[PDB]
Design a protein around this ligand. Structure first.
Ligand code: H0Y
Length: 143
């Protein structure tokens, strides 16, 4: 479902904004997915992210930025195709984009990034997810 993905994105972003000191007011199997994803994002940010180039310096979102610009940049996470670890990085990257947005007084962009993330997730990532056991398999691995 594309609506459960939308909830999933919103859940992750709300968690990230709260954790980092900002307002989140910008907008069971499912809870198991959200919690494992929140947890995996923290782990990635804490231990893994710094091994890579900072993808946020490739993208400066303003109210005029088009989806396609976001899409092209996120595409780099998937230069070698999709795996769960890059999917997790994808969420963290969205969260970082949102934190930076709220920080520079462009909090309106948070809901747009959310929409962008759901769109990107629904067409580029979801086919690999369904092929590789769906989100329940993610919970088995990362929960
Ligand atoms: O296991 C893997 O293959 C894996 C796991 C997690 C991430 C990645 C991966 C693969 C390719 C790239 C990356 C990560 C990149 N990461 N750069 C990031 N920069 C930031 C900055 C903030 C929040 C998240 C991120 S993710 C940019 C360069 C291209 N690969």
């Amino acid at each position: 479902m594309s609506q459960s993905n939308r909830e999933l994105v919103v859940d992750f972003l709300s968690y990230k904004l709260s954790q980092k000191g900002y307002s989140w007011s910008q907008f069971t199997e499912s809870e198991a997915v959200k919690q494992a994803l929140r947890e995996a994002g923290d782990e990635f940010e804490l231990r893994y992210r710094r091994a890579f180039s900072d993808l946020t310096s490739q993208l400066h979102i303003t109210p005029g930025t088009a989806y396609q610009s976001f899409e092209q940049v996120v595409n780099e996470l998937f230069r070698d195709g999709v795996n769960w670890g890059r999917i997790v990085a994808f969420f963290s990257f969205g969260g970082a984009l949102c934190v930076e947005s709220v920080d520079k007084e462009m909090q309106v962009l948070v809901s747009r990034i959310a929409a962008w993330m759901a769109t990107y997730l629904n067409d580029h990532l979801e086919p690999w997810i369904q092929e590789n056991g769906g989100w329940d398999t993610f919970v088995e691995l990362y929960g």
